[PDB]
């Protein structure tokens, strides 16, 4: 786990991700059913990041996966979407922030990455799914 | 062309023949748990008879226990005119202590009446008995390992005129490389003396008395299980956690090695753990090593943090039975049973142990199984992360839950980088003396 | 089915499954597929739990029937602190196949015995062993030199309340549900009851049976008693237990402590194998005696 | 294993590839996780090469798979993206180069190739994946 | 694990598997998952082979543990001409779980015995039988009228080099690795060694044991000897073999050829079943004798 | 189970959903059939909701899943399609309404949600299925 | 089984359906093979109905599935494609009509339906497969 | 051991497991280090007897005996048990290959030479399952096993 | 294959499978994969049925070979009213592997015995048990006090036509194929044949064997006879049956009804276990007699 950097600034339109709940469920064939969750939090589970810049940005991005990445390190993640609460219900969110200001430390959900060359200077990679491991 | 319904045939052989390669029993399996498959063990020998064939195997025993022996080198019947023989009955292997209290077919014969010459069966290679100078020195056999007892000028008059089935009380000290280190009584004593004397009498305090007549024979459980793995060839055997007295176990030749050992795992209950390559044999206790909370289990295969199986009420072994050997008197097969008071309506589950132990101890063992087999109904099937991989395969987990905090000893650890566990419910109070009175 | 064939031979049918289990305690539980709470007997079947009803099997052979009956555990329901402690063991069920439009149109598929219950992941899965579960078990006596019966048994009737034998006293000092202090230890012998029934009739463990061991009174009639096994529900240091006396199941302990040596149902003498193949030698003791 | 040549010069826009890891993972179901890495390195795992030239280039490309290829030889690979380190984190890449200057010896990830004819002289083949065996 | 828990309780961990097998010959082999050659003991673990490490299992029961351990065979590696000939049979392994960042942070998962090795398609798959493989086998003597021990055994010590008993001569004429000509046949009796150890200590089959049969010298001390089985590695008509003498394991062949009739460990007389149920008839020979 | 709010007002064109039944069926192979119904009711089973507004609406929508959601609470659902009966056959619907006026209390059929960014202020999420647990 | 109504009048272009035959078959690997059918009729097996009208038509259509539907009732079906025979071969159809004039009583092949809203008044549902159970 | 096939390694078919020759070597812990019989004496008073054959290197365990109810002499019984202890250690190796129906005249009990790059070890075959692709579970068999042991008598 | 290796070693081959089964009745049936009717022997193999030919297996062990042989049943074919009635039981097959270009290039894969036939869904599936089906069965006599052989057997030859023993009469009144009226009942004793062979040699059940019981003549020589089992094919009240006489397999019924008491092949006296362990008491009858 690191505190190294946010990320390269660029993120394409389509960087999807929202909280994932265990939601162990019984599905009684009669009808209504009960359920419970053991988290009391929610893995934010961000996906579909895309780096799009020149090839000068690519070599600092492919080794972003490699050098401080490996697989098992933090690289605090910037959300385009210290305790934050959500008060729009009479219930509450009350979800903690270990890092400051929406920085949600994560890890990539990939054994490999796949960077493409689309023109003399264009560097693209289609997806880097994360899950914000605590 | 297509395939037939020998797709079921190739699913068995050798589709399942590869499994048992790399791997009454009614109560034997529950006591070992999920564990492993309990091998058939210890059909106790009643009416010990001596067969003079060539296909019977060499017996082995540890401590004071009767063994049948068999005939090797009997001379022809000699009529004095009303018969006479020269037997030699071979009891068991290894260096033994002396053979006393011979009784033939029937009750008892006095050994002073006999002309027997006992032999230890020493690896020192005892010479010829010279009663085999009937054969002559040039063909006299000189048995190295086996401990034969010759009989000289035996009158066949009191027991018919046929040969009677002789049975012999034998005392054999536990041997092997772990046994010669750490000597117990049988050579550790190095001169006790202090014979109380001071002469129907006052034997009511013999079970609590300081003097060591009779029970000096009984070998510690540490070296007998060391003798098994020594004879099997495992010298890497680790047995410092064992605390028991054997008092006359007996398994025959070709008793699988482990099936002789597996009777001891029912009596003294020990783990046969094998954390590392040492194969640690530790005595089973409730001493908790893990202390997992419910929050600290890993994500299993079946996607349940803890699958908890409670076994059927119709199979709980409502009453348990043994077939121990009397071990104080005339060594005979006996039986005690423990009956649970609420559910005595059925499920008799008994097994037979070929060792010899006393009367209050047998009711102690069956009192322990009937408690344990009803405790070991609950099994847990969870997965714990390799962040704490030092949970060895035989440890016991506290396993805090929202409802219960019930302990669990574990079996069948299959990890591959995700330790997945088939536990079983174990309480600490099961492993105690029952404190019962004697016979 | 019993005279719902007029309902059933029509393709338009509406038979919704439903079943009741009766626990070892007197209460029953209700379960239905119908998704609306319905009842025909005084059971009040609840669709809040139970009821996946997977594939009841049959057989003319003595082998049991089976139904795994997947469901849910909840506070109204089984709740699994009830189940783990030792209840629902010999729980008897009847599965029904009721018409929800008219619950008087029903039958029993089988009456089961619910052998193996596997709970996990917030749910339970309970194998319904068939009617013939008791067959397939060993029942017998083996001529052993102890007794063979329990105290309440017909083979040894005792009248277990006949004097100051039972210890009725309310409990204090429950500790780890194996040790029990017991405020009213005094009133009996030391080590009086060593194999008895610790029936606890109040509080959390209601009507739960354990077996005693180590009946020792340490000071001023404390009577610290162990048990073989946990009760599975913690007593709350205010519950009432009663402990029937302990039987060692031996002739000496039978006739001395208890009067009932007549109803022994045991085999004290039982000579032995070596007696059987023995031929009578004409030496030493050969007069009529005990052989003991 | 060879040191024979880089490759035919032509590579179409879309030649994708990025480093791998095994990094097996347990995902402790009631909290965070713990995960192991046995590599200390990364397979670069380049994919999706395309040859596009005349049919004169094709016969030197189909036997590139065959002659020095077979299956089990090097053919050092050119990256459009002696030890190189990556210093943009306070961690380090420090990944070795057995060959000189980004030449990453590989092998093709194919039992067969598939060259197509697109016009009288057009030669195309859609993919030749590699994994850079040491 | 042994005091790497500080390393392991952190989610950031890096434990790469690795193991060494010691063959029956003195050499060991190294294997690791780490993809870089590493060592902590003098073993030099190579990631060039071995190492898929699939699912070590455990059990409190006497049943063995198992790990199939998929890998690769190569010239540096096992190479399978070594494996097929008869090596790697009782090969002893230790699997380790080393930290590749610091190899002093390691433990043993189990110490195995590598029972079943299935090689195919240019690879090998080798089942790692657990520590308890020897248990589960039958060991015993059955009172048979031969001997029971081998020559070097403790139950019959012999000093097998004590005279001109062993035939140390170098080999010629290996033919089909069953027939062996042997240039120096002369020096011994005809049919001297019929059950002996053909230990071959040089060349291809280094330290490989076969059993002799048909010790016949045809002309001028040729001593053409067969074997029961192939050696599995071809000797190169220049190797050195030594052949210990042959024991028929019989009392007559014991005392005549060898002096060691004292250390017999056999059961020559062993009367029989028909003797046992026989009652003594008072006719014919009823005086004390051999019964042979 | 809550009584908290209907929902965010926005719902895209395509919010599909209709009642269910188990009604297991045997299909007697040599003639007609016979089939059983254990429900007497129907799960309304609404699917394919889409939130489409500014990013100001998104943070009150992602924590709608989180704060009063969790997994196991009501959030009464508004239908664009106290007992209501359906009298257009001579049979009857006679289906109850536990909540008032078509409000059908539900739960989301998701372990996770997936909100996307479509432009500087566009927030989209493609689906939130529900089944109306009692 | 009912005699309630035909259906809502609207059916979109694409309402597919044709007779379904058991046609138990042996497929001998030699060559030609024999076959037989146990029906002596043919399930007409109509699929892909679509309701498309205003939302006033939807509430009489969603409870068409529910009220007289459930799962297990008739609702005689109108075919846009008393005994009818087919005489265009020298063989004969001779297929019965239990209901009058092509009305073919059916049931929907669905555990649930899925009605969509496509605009302020547009109601759509993509499919209602039937099989005309006798 | 009379070889009927003479396959090279190039002449096997493509099997199911996509290996030309899967070769299984059995466990060392189960090789039957010593073998036993229970024959009948057949010359004297017919009584149950026993001989055993003990392999000199590995005598440490794996006793595997069986009982034959026929009657045979003394040198013959030690000949049989001498044959099994050699064969059961030879028959550790089994091969699992597939050979094409171009040579289907390999009957189910024949023995294959099976030239390899490393060895040229014979194999007798079992469990032929063809369906138009003869797939074989062979087993290792040497010729010299089936000979008289030439032992002295009683 | 037998000298089609010249055809077979070429990759261009054309061997199409084909087989003939010979029923218990004298007729054979033909089957081929070739899709054109072909023959080499007088069998006329038809591709109209049979022939999926799935995976003949082999084994040096005594265990049988197997081939499930999926196919079709039709009026020319097996037709399954033939099969269900009791034919095709011990049907013997030979599978062939003929060249359809030249049927003189063929061999036999195995000669089977067609044990288990499972028909369903308008098709049949018939397991071809191998040559060694008869091995694996128990054959023996157990010294029981009856006889042990059938009437036609070599161990008791009878000449079953030697007098008016057999009842040759044609059948009327077949009813439910268990009761048979028989117009010509008269000619024999009441209850003459109680265990006989009802061989029916005409009509539907042609050459089909049942066993008689309850040979009773009610009025004017009706001779209503039951059977143990159905014939499986209905006789048409005009068929001709012949019934061999009934043997009770007992010494009294042997010698009285039949003359052949010499060829008994039975064990009448067979003293008993209690005789064997009995020692002779010198009281009562101890003179030589029958012991019966
Ligand atoms: S001692 Fe008496 S009361 Fe107790 S169990 Fe035995 S017979 Fe019954
Ligand atoms: S003959 Fe002698 S040396 Fe040979 S095995 Fe027997 S006892 Fe040992
Ligand atoms: S009674 Fe005579 S004819 Fe009949 S079976 Fe017996 S021996 Fe044969």
mmCIF file with all atom_site columns, C-alpha atoms in Angstrom, chain B residues 113-220:
data_model
loop_
_atom_site.group_PDB
_atom_site.id
_atom_site.type_symbol
_atom_site.label_atom_id
_atom_site.label_alt_id
_atom_site.label_comp_id
_atom_site.label_asym_id
_atom_site.label_entity_id
_atom_site.label_seq_id
_atom_site.pdbx_PDB_ins_code
_atom_site.Cartn_x
_atom_site.Cartn_y
_atom_site.Cartn_z
_atom_site.occupancy
_atom_site.B_iso_or_equiv
_atom_site.pdbx_formal_charge
_atom_site.auth_seq_id
_atom_site.auth_comp_id
_atom_site.auth_asym_id
_atom_site.auth_atom_id
_atom_site.pdbx_PDB_model_num
ATOM 1   C CA . UNK B 1 113 ? 5.852  -78.422 36.495 1.00 0.00 ? 113 UNK B CA 1
ATOM 2   C CA . UNK B 1 114 ? 7.208  -77.647 33.048 1.00 0.00 ? 114 UNK B CA 1
ATOM 3   C CA . UNK B 1 115 ? 10.742 -77.879 31.728 1.00 0.00 ? 115 UNK B CA 1
ATOM 4   C CA . UNK B 1 116 ? 10.424 -74.827 29.481 1.00 0.00 ? 116 UNK B CA 1
ATOM 5   C CA . UNK B 1 117 ? 13.397 -72.785 28.353 1.00 0.00 ? 117 UNK B CA 1
ATOM 6   C CA . UNK B 1 118 ? 12.278 -69.266 27.465 1.00 0.00 ? 118 UNK B CA 1
ATOM 7   C CA . UNK B 1 119 ? 14.317 -67.205 25.002 1.00 0.00 ? 119 UNK B CA 1
ATOM 8   C CA . UNK B 1 120 ? 14.432 -63.458 24.500 1.00 0.00 ? 120 UNK B CA 1
ATOM 9   C CA . UNK B 1 121 ? 14.827 -63.694 20.754 1.00 0.00 ? 121 UNK B CA 1
ATOM 10  C CA . UNK B 1 122 ? 17.832 -61.460 20.904 1.00 0.00 ? 122 UNK B CA 1
ATOM 11  C CA . UNK B 1 123 ? 19.428 -59.791 17.932 1.00 0.00 ? 123 UNK B CA 1
ATOM 12  C CA . UNK B 1 124 ? 22.596 -60.932 19.772 1.00 0.00 ? 124 UNK B CA 1
ATOM 13  C CA . UNK B 1 125 ? 21.632 -64.297 18.179 1.00 0.00 ? 125 UNK B CA 1
ATOM 14  C CA . UNK B 1 126 ? 21.142 -66.710 21.018 1.00 0.00 ? 126 UNK B CA 1
ATOM 15  C CA . UNK B 1 127 ? 22.651 -70.098 20.187 1.00 0.00 ? 127 UNK B CA 1
ATOM 16  C CA . UNK B 1 128 ? 20.883 -73.395 19.800 1.00 0.00 ? 128 UNK B CA 1
ATOM 17  C CA . UNK B 1 129 ? 18.831 -74.615 22.792 1.00 0.00 ? 129 UNK B CA 1
ATOM 18  C CA . UNK B 1 130 ? 20.621 -78.042 22.751 1.00 0.00 ? 130 UNK B CA 1
ATOM 19  C CA . UNK B 1 131 ? 17.231 -79.716 23.071 1.00 0.00 ? 131 UNK B CA 1
ATOM 20  C CA . UNK B 1 132 ? 17.375 -79.386 19.281 1.00 0.00 ? 132 UNK B CA 1
ATOM 21  C CA . UNK B 1 133 ? 20.377 -81.718 19.391 1.00 0.00 ? 133 UNK B CA 1
ATOM 22  C CA . UNK B 1 134 ? 17.672 -84.242 18.594 1.00 0.00 ? 134 UNK B CA 1
ATOM 23  C CA . UNK B 1 135 ? 18.146 -82.677 15.177 1.00 0.00 ? 135 UNK B CA 1
ATOM 24  C CA . UNK B 1 136 ? 21.864 -82.183 15.752 1.00 0.00 ? 136 UNK B CA 1
ATOM 25  C CA . UNK B 1 137 ? 24.031 -79.083 15.748 1.00 0.00 ? 137 UNK B CA 1
ATOM 26  C CA . UNK B 1 138 ? 24.516 -79.073 11.984 1.00 0.00 ? 138 UNK B CA 1
ATOM 27  C CA . UNK B 1 139 ? 20.812 -78.475 11.330 1.00 0.00 ? 139 UNK B CA 1
ATOM 28  C CA . UNK B 1 140 ? 19.868 -76.657 14.532 1.00 0.00 ? 140 UNK B CA 1
ATOM 29  C CA . UNK B 1 141 ? 17.953 -73.529 13.607 1.00 0.00 ? 141 UNK B CA 1
ATOM 30  C CA . UNK B 1 142 ? 19.141 -70.747 16.016 1.00 0.00 ? 142 UNK B CA 1
ATOM 31  C CA . UNK B 1 143 ? 16.326 -68.229 15.663 1.00 0.00 ? 143 UNK B CA 1
ATOM 32  C CA . UNK B 1 144 ? 17.596 -64.652 15.727 1.00 0.00 ? 144 UNK B CA 1
ATOM 33  C CA . UNK B 1 145 ? 14.648 -62.286 15.891 1.00 0.00 ? 145 UNK B CA 1
ATOM 34  C CA . UNK B 1 146 ? 11.690 -64.359 17.047 1.00 0.00 ? 146 UNK B CA 1
ATOM 35  C CA . UNK B 1 147 ? 11.246 -65.258 20.725 1.00 0.00 ? 147 UNK B CA 1
ATOM 36  C CA . UNK B 1 148 ? 10.537 -68.967 20.898 1.00 0.00 ? 148 UNK B CA 1
ATOM 37  C CA . UNK B 1 149 ? 9.826  -71.012 24.013 1.00 0.00 ? 149 UNK B CA 1
ATOM 38  C CA . UNK B 1 150 ? 10.829 -74.668 23.919 1.00 0.00 ? 150 UNK B CA 1
ATOM 39  C CA . UNK B 1 151 ? 9.132  -77.302 26.049 1.00 0.00 ? 151 UNK B CA 1
ATOM 40  C CA . UNK B 1 152 ? 11.025 -80.350 27.259 1.00 0.00 ? 152 UNK B CA 1
ATOM 41  C CA . UNK B 1 153 ? 9.639  -83.839 27.975 1.00 0.00 ? 153 UNK B CA 1
ATOM 42  C CA . UNK B 1 154 ? 6.116  -82.501 28.159 1.00 0.00 ? 154 UNK B CA 1
ATOM 43  C CA . UNK B 1 155 ? 3.747  -85.138 29.485 1.00 0.00 ? 155 UNK B CA 1
ATOM 44  C CA . UNK B 1 156 ? 0.585  -85.039 27.403 1.00 0.00 ? 156 UNK B CA 1
ATOM 45  C CA . UNK B 1 157 ? -1.218 -86.988 30.130 1.00 0.00 ? 157 UNK B CA 1
ATOM 46  C CA . UNK B 1 158 ? -3.330 -84.374 32.043 1.00 0.00 ? 158 UNK B CA 1
ATOM 47  C CA . UNK B 1 159 ? -4.863 -82.742 28.952 1.00 0.00 ? 159 UNK B CA 1
ATOM 48  C CA . UNK B 1 160 ? -6.068 -85.763 27.008 1.00 0.00 ? 160 UNK B CA 1
ATOM 49  C CA . UNK B 1 161 ? -3.200 -87.098 24.992 1.00 0.00 ? 161 UNK B CA 1
ATOM 50  C CA . UNK B 1 162 ? -3.508 -84.677 22.088 1.00 0.00 ? 162 UNK B CA 1
ATOM 51  C CA . UNK B 1 163 ? -1.496 -81.492 21.912 1.00 0.00 ? 163 UNK B CA 1
ATOM 52  C CA . UNK B 1 164 ? -3.295 -78.739 23.864 1.00 0.00 ? 164 UNK B CA 1
ATOM 53  C CA . UNK B 1 165 ? -3.523 -75.152 22.684 1.00 0.00 ? 165 UNK B CA 1
ATOM 54  C CA . UNK B 1 166 ? -0.953 -73.307 24.763 1.00 0.00 ? 166 UNK B CA 1
ATOM 55  C CA . UNK B 1 167 ? -1.331 -69.605 25.527 1.00 0.00 ? 167 UNK B CA 1
ATOM 56  C CA . UNK B 1 168 ? 1.451  -67.542 27.093 1.00 0.00 ? 168 UNK B CA 1
ATOM 57  C CA . UNK B 1 169 ? 1.564  -64.321 29.042 1.00 0.00 ? 169 UNK B CA 1
ATOM 58  C CA . UNK B 1 170 ? 4.398  -62.356 27.436 1.00 0.00 ? 170 UNK B CA 1
ATOM 59  C CA . UNK B 1 171 ? 6.053  -59.132 28.599 1.00 0.00 ? 171 UNK B CA 1
ATOM 60  C CA . UNK B 1 172 ? 7.730  -57.229 25.772 1.00 0.00 ? 172 UNK B CA 1
ATOM 61  C CA . UNK B 1 173 ? 9.512  -53.926 26.207 1.00 0.00 ? 173 UNK B CA 1
ATOM 62  C CA . UNK B 1 174 ? 9.040  -51.277 23.547 1.00 0.00 ? 174 UNK B CA 1
ATOM 63  C CA . UNK B 1 175 ? 12.103 -51.067 21.311 1.00 0.00 ? 175 UNK B CA 1
ATOM 64  C CA . UNK B 1 176 ? 13.299 -48.903 18.469 1.00 0.00 ? 176 UNK B CA 1
ATOM 65  C CA . UNK B 1 177 ? 15.664 -45.976 18.174 1.00 0.00 ? 177 UNK B CA 1
ATOM 66  C CA . UNK B 1 178 ? 13.370 -43.542 19.957 1.00 0.00 ? 178 UNK B CA 1
ATOM 67  C CA . UNK B 1 179 ? 12.886 -46.076 22.736 1.00 0.00 ? 179 UNK B CA 1
ATOM 68  C CA . UNK B 1 180 ? 16.540 -46.638 23.600 1.00 0.00 ? 180 UNK B CA 1
ATOM 69  C CA . UNK B 1 181 ? 16.895 -42.921 24.030 1.00 0.00 ? 181 UNK B CA 1
ATOM 70  C CA . UNK B 1 182 ? 14.672 -41.709 26.889 1.00 0.00 ? 182 UNK B CA 1
ATOM 71  C CA . UNK B 1 183 ? 14.496 -44.963 28.874 1.00 0.00 ? 183 UNK B CA 1
ATOM 72  C CA . UNK B 1 184 ? 11.289 -45.652 30.799 1.00 0.00 ? 184 UNK B CA 1
ATOM 73  C CA . UNK B 1 185 ? 11.059 -48.111 33.752 1.00 0.00 ? 185 UNK B CA 1
ATOM 74  C CA . UNK B 1 186 ? 11.833 -51.259 31.835 1.00 0.00 ? 186 UNK B CA 1
ATOM 75  C CA . UNK B 1 187 ? 15.526 -50.280 31.814 1.00 0.00 ? 187 UNK B CA 1
ATOM 76  C CA . UNK B 1 188 ? 15.256 -46.699 33.182 1.00 0.00 ? 188 UNK B CA 1
ATOM 77  C CA . UNK B 1 189 ? 14.639 -47.984 36.746 1.00 0.00 ? 189 UNK B CA 1
ATOM 78  C CA . UNK B 1 190 ? 18.304 -49.115 37.114 1.00 0.00 ? 190 UNK B CA 1
ATOM 79  C CA . UNK B 1 191 ? 17.508 -50.857 40.490 1.00 0.00 ? 191 UNK B CA 1
ATOM 80  C CA . UNK B 1 192 ? 14.320 -49.991 42.502 1.00 0.00 ? 192 UNK B CA 1
ATOM 81  C CA . UNK B 1 193 ? 14.332 -52.559 45.372 1.00 0.00 ? 193 UNK B CA 1
ATOM 82  C CA . UNK B 1 194 ? 12.396 -51.245 48.454 1.00 0.00 ? 194 UNK B CA 1
ATOM 83  C CA . UNK B 1 195 ? 10.122 -54.352 48.615 1.00 0.00 ? 195 UNK B CA 1
ATOM 84  C CA . UNK B 1 196 ? 7.409  -53.269 51.206 1.00 0.00 ? 196 UNK B CA 1
ATOM 85  C CA . UNK B 1 197 ? 6.960  -56.748 52.772 1.00 0.00 ? 197 UNK B CA 1
ATOM 86  C CA . UNK B 1 198 ? 5.714  -56.392 56.393 1.00 0.00 ? 198 UNK B CA 1
ATOM 87  C CA . UNK B 1 199 ? 3.268  -59.318 55.899 1.00 0.00 ? 199 UNK B CA 1
ATOM 88  C CA . UNK B 1 200 ? -7.507 -61.619 52.715 1.00 0.00 ? 200 UNK B CA 1
ATOM 89  C CA . UNK B 1 201 ? -5.259 -58.549 52.826 1.00 0.00 ? 201 UNK B CA 1
ATOM 90  C CA . UNK B 1 202 ? -5.069 -54.810 52.174 1.00 0.00 ? 202 UNK B CA 1
ATOM 91  C CA . UNK B 1 203 ? -5.203 -54.304 48.432 1.00 0.00 ? 203 UNK B CA 1
ATOM 92  C CA . UNK B 1 204 ? -7.861 -51.594 48.513 1.00 0.00 ? 204 UNK B CA 1
ATOM 93  C CA . UNK B 1 205 ? -5.089 -49.020 48.187 1.00 0.00 ? 205 UNK B CA 1
ATOM 94  C CA . UNK B 1 206 ? -3.177 -50.818 45.426 1.00 0.00 ? 206 UNK B CA 1
ATOM 95  C CA . UNK B 1 207 ? -4.472 -48.500 42.713 1.00 0.00 ? 207 UNK B CA 1
ATOM 96  C CA . UNK B 1 208 ? -3.139 -45.570 44.733 1.00 0.00 ? 208 UNK B CA 1
ATOM 97  C CA . UNK B 1 209 ? -0.146 -47.224 46.384 1.00 0.00 ? 209 UNK B CA 1
ATOM 98  C CA . UNK B 1 210 ? 3.433  -46.182 45.737 1.00 0.00 ? 210 UNK B CA 1
ATOM 99  C CA . UNK B 1 211 ? 4.684  -49.669 44.950 1.00 0.00 ? 211 UNK B CA 1
ATOM 100 C CA . UNK B 1 212 ? 5.098  -50.657 41.336 1.00 0.00 ? 212 UNK B CA 1
ATOM 101 C CA . UNK B 1 213 ? 4.292  -54.370 41.143 1.00 0.00 ? 213 UNK B CA 1
ATOM 102 C CA . UNK B 1 214 ? 2.554  -55.274 37.919 1.00 0.00 ? 214 UNK B CA 1
ATOM 103 C CA . UNK B 1 215 ? 2.389  -51.820 36.388 1.00 0.00 ? 215 UNK B CA 1
ATOM 104 C CA . UNK B 1 216 ? 6.168  -51.615 35.964 1.00 0.00 ? 216 UNK B CA 1
ATOM 105 C CA . UNK B 1 217 ? 5.731  -53.580 32.733 1.00 0.00 ? 217 UNK B CA 1
ATOM 106 C CA . UNK B 1 218 ? 3.481  -51.100 30.913 1.00 0.00 ? 218 UNK B CA 1
ATOM 107 C CA . UNK B 1 219 ? 5.306  -49.079 28.287 1.00 0.00 ? 219 UNK B CA 1
ATOM 108 C CA . UNK B 1 220 ? 4.732  -45.372 27.732 1.00 0.00 ? 220 UNK B CA 1
#
